[PDB]
Design an enzyme around this catalytic site. Structure first.
Site, short mmCIF file in Angstrom:
data_model
loop_
_atom_site.label_atom_id
_atom_site.label_comp_id
_atom_site.label_asym_id
_atom_site.label_seq_id
_atom_site.Cartn_x
_atom_site.Cartn_y
_atom_site.Cartn_z
N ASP A 242 65.75 86.83 38.27
CA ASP A 242 64.53 87.20 38.37
C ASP A 242 64.00 87.56 36.91
O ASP A 242 64.55 88.39 36.17
CB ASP A 242 64.35 88.50 39.27
CG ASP A 242 64.92 88.13 40.57
OD1 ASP A 242 64.25 87.12 41.11
OD2 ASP A 242 65.61 88.71 41.14
N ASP B 198 70.82 85.67 35.00
CA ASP B 198 70.09 86.46 35.73
C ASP B 198 69.10 85.65 36.39
O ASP B 198 68.62 84.60 35.77
CB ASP B 198 69.62 87.65 34.69
CG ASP B 198 68.53 88.28 35.60
OD1 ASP B 198 68.97 88.84 36.62
OD2 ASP B 198 67.20 88.48 35.13
MG MG Z 1 65.90 89.81 35.60
#
Ligand code: MG
Ligand code: BR
Ligand code: BR
Ligand code: BR
Ligand code: BR
Ligand code: BR
Ligand code: BR
Ligand code: BR
Ligand code: BR
Ligand code: BR
Ligand code: BR
Ligand code: BR
Ligand code: BR
Ligand code: BR
Ligand code: BR
Ligand code: BR
Ligand code: BR
Ligand code: BR
Ligand code: BR
Ligand code: BR
Ligand code: BR
Ligand code: BR
Ligand code: BR
Ligand code: BR
Ligand code: BR
Ligand code: BR
Ligand code: BR
Ligand code: BR
Ligand code: BR
Ligand code: BR
Ligand code: BR
Ligand code: MG
Ligand code: MG
Ligand code: MG
EC number: 3.1.3.2
Lengths: 209, 209, 209, 209
Positions: free
Chosen positions: A43, A41
């Site tokens: 962020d 992922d």
């Molecule tokens: Mg995230």
């Protein structure tokens, strides 16, 4: 709430039943496994990108979450505002480790897609990822002409998926990948913080920075 | 050491990489396993027995560890001084759980054996263990006429061994049983405290009391 | 309660607002103060005496708090059962420090008084307190023929009172003495644990053992 | 360093002797004091401005700390890059509290001064500071035509100075102001983290976000 709440040593020592792991334990668990595909992922997993989201929010929708459906926001967020995003040390360590193993590195994001994006580049540069290990950011979701994150994991044979949100871990679980949790920084603007460890998954120690 | 050492938030939030588990998680990991034999070390695992050890040390050898090779000590320790031993709450939960499941419960100790011993009875009384689930304490060691803790675990087909000390977990590892660590209390007189999780084993949260 | 409650870094780093102090800081705050009188509560302040209380409760009143109004209990508790009480390290440091300074040392307890008591001697022995610094234990309370803890602190000009319980700190506050809190151990049988720092008082770090 | 280091409950409960305080305790300590002047460091005290410094560093001096002596860096840092700086909750709480008391709010920074600056404005806007309470950011240091932070504190009669760095607390100490520490976030790019509490000063709980 009381002015002097005090404490006691049951609370001072109290532990949540989390399966904590280190980067070294993960590498160890993989030892003598041949090169594989793994994914991240973006962020609050590899980038503290809150600065960009916080500028976005104030600039486009100070009173709601509408900026996140605004294409003018996404064009800026995906094409330079990551220059203020702060790389996470835990991600430097994991990426160097996965580069050391010859692994293929994927980044899979729920950010809205835009015409162009320099995030892929910011990530290859900040984390010293060789071109050969690196792969263009995948923008996943349920818009027409997208695949979901689980479909992408299945599609890329991603075996380990690193992330801070519940949906990161469930997406890995759905396709039988190993979902490993990273702690979201308490100064992130994305709140509430997830409950790291809520599916019984591995959580990496000290992974907020 | 400075008068005002100060601190910082990397240190306040720092976690060691330990596999923490709850009693509830362990009961769930055994869901639909039929009755089996499980075992417990005694001292600092189900009883805080430092009061008797402490009294022993002061009485028989203020200046050495010699009291522990003194038969006059062991006779007092195993025939009453455990009336001052304080049962651990983690052990009440574990034992009530294993009783629920219909498991056979063993206590395997490294204490020196004596003519008679009322420890078995202290444990059946304090922990409300049904005679059917209960088993007299096994005194294990390397003395002639003894078998080792590992041989006893193999002999009783003990599948889970709970203990606070490194040798508890490695004795379990030796025979392929699940070794599960309990935290020794910081006011125990047996020091230094073990490094719980030193073998990557499960450690029960909050198990110091 | 969930099987996998999870956690987050705001919770891992969270601190209650407590005035923590070290023994070293307290010795420094008293630098160049001439000899004075100081006092200590006994139970869970300098001795982990739960073994005797526990033994008491099981023997005299398995089912109530009645043992504590039983003179037969108090006679056993104060004439030997403290041979099973475990001295606290924080108390060895504090008392050695106060001895160094030439302070007069008082123990003020809420235990019921008895014909004879060997607690004074257990404390002078265990803590290596010179007879010149040492004072026989004061049994304080609201019984006829007693004075309260506060009156005793006023009467002895005790400037510092150490204790684990709320009444220790408020008795100090009553007479203008410095009340300093010690953490009660989580395996004490006296529950619930006090909220150390409930009055904005100093609490000694790591003082549970 | 070992693959499985383990831990023990002395370490799990261990506390540094910090004087922790809450916002409510500070307000309480000031109760019925008339309006006064108080001051705030900026960076990692009220703003997580690392994004700007991190962009600065990468853009101007990826291999040294020279960007901090470069006027082109400071022009950008002081005239808009704070739009990516993330306000700290602890600072919202303190500023609202000090606004509630009618206090005069000063910000005193060690940033290099530039021809213009919009930091003052970012701060009045983000923290809802009424014009009447607000004061233009003061750029302190030892360049010719500057006063130092202590001289400014003395000059403005600032009674409380909030900050994350040792120099914030010493500057307050120098002029007899009350220096109160705020924790620097572990994801700040300014490292090493200071030892909050190193002068015996008050440190605010949970003040990393
Ligand atoms: Mg995230
Ligand atoms: Br809006
Ligand atoms: Br919008
Ligand atoms: Br840009
Ligand atoms: Br790193
Ligand atoms: Br797309
Ligand atoms: Br998706
Ligand atoms: Br989430
Ligand atoms: Br939260
Ligand atoms: Br489970
Ligand atoms: Br001896
Ligand atoms: Br002996
Ligand atoms: Br219990
Ligand atoms: Br053995
Ligand atoms: Br051990
Ligand atoms: Br230790
Ligand atoms: Br001090
Ligand atoms: Br009864
Ligand atoms: Br009774
Ligand atoms: Br000691
Ligand atoms: Br009293
Ligand atoms: Br209390
Ligand atoms: Br409690
Ligand atoms: Br450079
Ligand atoms: Br430069
Ligand atoms: Br700008
Ligand atoms: Br807030
Ligand atoms: Br200036
Ligand atoms: Br200065
Ligand atoms: Br500093
Ligand atoms: Br650091
Ligand atoms: Mg043991
Ligand atoms: Mg007490
Ligand atoms: Mg600062």
């Amino acid at each position: 709430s009381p002015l002097n709440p005090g404490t006691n040593v049951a609370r001072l020592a109290e532990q949540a039943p989390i399966h904590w792991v280190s980067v070294a334990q993960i590498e160890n668990s993989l030892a003598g496994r041949p090169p594989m595909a793994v994914g991240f992922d973006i962020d609050d997993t590899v980038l503290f990108s809150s600065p960009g989201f916080w500028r976005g929010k104030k600039t486009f929708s100070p009173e709601s979450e509408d900026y996140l459906k605004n294409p003018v926001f996404w064009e800026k967020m995906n094409n330079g505002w990551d220059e203020f995003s702060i790389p996470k040390e835990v991600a430097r360590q994991l990426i160097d480790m996965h580069v050391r193993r010859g692994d293929a590195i994927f980044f899979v994001t729920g950010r809205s897609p835009t015409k162009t994006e320099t995030v892929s580049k910011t990530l290859a540069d900040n984390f010293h990822i060789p071109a050969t290990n690196m792969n263009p950011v995948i923008f996943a979701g349920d818009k027409p002409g997208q695949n979901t994150k689980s479909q992408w994991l299945q599609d890329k044979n991603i075996r380990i998926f690193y992330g801070d949100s519940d949906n990161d871990i469930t997406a890995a679980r759905d396709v039988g990948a190993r979902g490993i949790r990273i702690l979201r920084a308490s100064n992130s603007t994305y709140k509430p913080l997830p409950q790291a460890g809520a599916f019984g998954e591995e959580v990496i120690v000290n992974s907020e920075y």
